[PDB]
Amino acid sequence: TGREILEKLERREFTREVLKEALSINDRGFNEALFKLADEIRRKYVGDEVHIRAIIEFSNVCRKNCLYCGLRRDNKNLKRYRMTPEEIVERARLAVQFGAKTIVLQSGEDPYXMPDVISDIVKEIKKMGVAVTLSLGEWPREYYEKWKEAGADRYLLRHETANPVLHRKLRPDTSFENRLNCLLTLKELGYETGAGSMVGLPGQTIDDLVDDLLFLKEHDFDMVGIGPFIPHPDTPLANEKKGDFTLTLKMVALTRILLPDSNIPATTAMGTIVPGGREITLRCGANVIMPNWTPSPYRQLYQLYPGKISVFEKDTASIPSVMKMIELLGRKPGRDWGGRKRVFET
Ligand SMILES: C[C@H](CCC(=O)NCCC[N+](C)(C)CCCS(=O)(=O)[O-])[C@H]1CC[C@H]2[C@@H]3[C@H](O)C[C@@H]4C[C@H](O)CC[C@]4(C)[C@H]3C[C@H](O)[C@]12C
Ligand SMILES: C[C@H](CCC(=O)NCCC[N+](C)(C)CCCS(=O)(=O)[O-])[C@H]1CC[C@H]2[C@@H]3[C@H](O)C[C@@H]4C[C@H](O)CC[C@]4(C)[C@H]3C[C@H](O)[C@]12C
Ligand SMILES: Nc1ncnc2c1ncn2[C@@H]1O[C@H](CSCC[C@H](N)C(=O)O)[C@@H](O)[C@H]1O
Ligand SMILES: C[C@@]1(C(=O)O)N[C@H](C(=O)O)CS1
Ligand code: SF4
Ligand SMILES: [Cl-]
């Protein structure tokens, strides 16, 4: 019964069986109660501030070949670009001028910048008095250490899938083990660390999703980025099914319930598969939003999956747009850097 599962969730009986049933029940009333629970947990623990992380996708060059990703190295149908360090710093400055309190630098695994150009960029952005989050993929500890010494605050490295067999199949250059080692290293170096996963990957099962939730719980990540898998026509997964919005939303909601004080974005992928998906997600456990701040004529080339959100709007539309979103949700923009504010429990 759906009611028994919600009771257990409310009592924080976070067993595999409970999480599996939560993800297997498709009853609308159960789902809506789950979303309300997550929304209330979000309200109680992280409040009504929605933290804005302005993301600059500063290079779409990648040395890896992940099967799902439009930036994979084998995709020849893609103009590759690299912003210069000056362009990145000035674009970050413009986001700070627009009120962003966190700058996220994300890219393919582009060796050109690594590690020293990243360090120089981070140092310049940190002068602006904002948090800097990096999302550059898997690199040696030495690089992550240099970036931390340069002043980076946070690192996003979604674990993608906690199923090691699936992980290796989809990410043939690496492994779940490596991905986890990178995350443990990031945590060890003092980064606020983000993990997270895609929902609806080919061959991924409900049991895999439970394992994702249990993995996030085990490691108590500061941030959890979750979104559907969205097939990209220029990849081997082009003909696979897109991930389901409601299932993904349930993952976000259960992540909030499991990690009540975590920072959880309403991802662009969620707004891509369902119009208004980000706003729904903000009402079902998420408390972060990541407006796209990549400048034209690059923005349109950073296509991890085929997207329509923000591609045709102005270069600077996204931050004002998310501030309007936050207001029409009756929420507030983050007042500080929006670091995780741990509430220690039992
Ligand atoms: C907005 C729609 C439709 C609401 C509706 O059906 N009516 C609105 C009430 C206004 N009035 C009563 C005055 C209308 C007049 C007619 S009436 O005759 O009803 O008086 C309602 C119906 C189902 C609701 C979601 C679910 O809960 C799940 C979830 C819980 C979270 O916590 C918040 C997020 C989310 C997604 C909820 C959002 C929103 O809330 C929904 C979509
Ligand atoms: C960037 C340019 C030129 C002047 C400038 O370079 N301004 C730096 C501001 C630096 N901060 C944002 C950190 C100030 C925060 C002070 S605050 O008192 O808001 O805490 C300024 C001039 C008018 C400013 C917009 C409007 O205002 C409306 C709106 C207010 C929201 O709020 C943030 C978003 C938005 C769109 C603003 C963005 C940006 O800012 C604009 C374009
Ligand atoms: N086709 C697709 N559909 C949905 N999300 C995707 C996707 N391709 C990639 N992503 C998501 O985009 C995230 C950022 S990829 C960019 C950062 C870095 N190269 C890295 O791999 O970590 C990935 O973690 C992945 O979960
Ligand atoms: C920035 C990111 C995230 O959840 O941190 N969101 C992106 C998106 O949903 O498109 C993929 S990675
Ligand atoms: S997911 Fe990241 S590492 Fe994998 S191909 Fe895409 S950009 Fe490169
Ligand atoms: Cl962040």
- Which ligand 3 atom minimizes the distance to the CA of 157? 22
Backbone angles phi, psi at 260, to 5 degrees: -65, -25
Task: Indicate which technique resolved this structure.
Answer: X-ray
C-alpha–C-alpha distance, residues 43 and 38, integer Å: 8
CA 249 distance to own-chain centroid: 13
DSSP letter for each residue of 122-152: HHHHHTTS-EEEEE-----HHHHHHHHHTT-
Is the minimum distance from the CB of 290 to ligand 4 under 6 angstroms?
Answer: yes
Does the beta carbon of 225 lie inside 6 Å of ligand 4? yes
- CA separation for the pair 53, 101 (Å, rounded): 7
Omega into 115 within 30° of 0, i.e. cis?
yes
Cα atoms in the 13 Å half-sphere on the side-chain side of 199: 26
Centroid of ligand 4 to alpha carbon of 153 (angstroms): 17
CATH topology of domain 1-346: TIM Barrel (3.20.20)
Measuring from each residue's beta carbon to the nearest atom of ligand 5, which residues come in under 6 Å? 62, 64, 66, 69, 71-72, 108-109, 137
Structure-token match 């630098």, residue found: 105
**130 vs 109: CA distance, rounded Å:** 24
Burial of 245 from C-beta contacts in 10 A (0-12 / 13-18 / 19+): buried
Ligand 5 pocket test target in 76, 109, 161 with most atoms within 8 Å of CB:
109
The domain segmentation of the chain, as residue ranges, is: 1-346
Show the tokens assigned to 213.
Answer: 């939730």
> Resolution, rounded to a tenth of an Å?
1.4
For residue 249, give the amino acid letter.
L
Q: What is the DSSP letter of 203?
A: T
> CB under 6 Å to ligand 3: residues?
68-69, 106, 108-109, 135, 137, 157-158, 160, 198, 227, 229-230, 232, 269, 304-305
Q: Using a 6 Å cutoff on CB, does residue 332 contact ligand 1?
A: no
111: tokens are 């060796």
Question: In sequence order, what are the residues at sequence separation of 6 or more whose Cβ sits closer than 8 angstroms to the Cβ of residue 43?
Answer: none
- Calpha distance 254→338 (Å, rounded): 21
Q: Count of CB atoms within 10 A of residue 344's CB?
A: 5
How far apart are the CA of 290 and the centre of ligand 4, in A?
8
CB of 34 closer than 8 Å to CB of 250:
yes
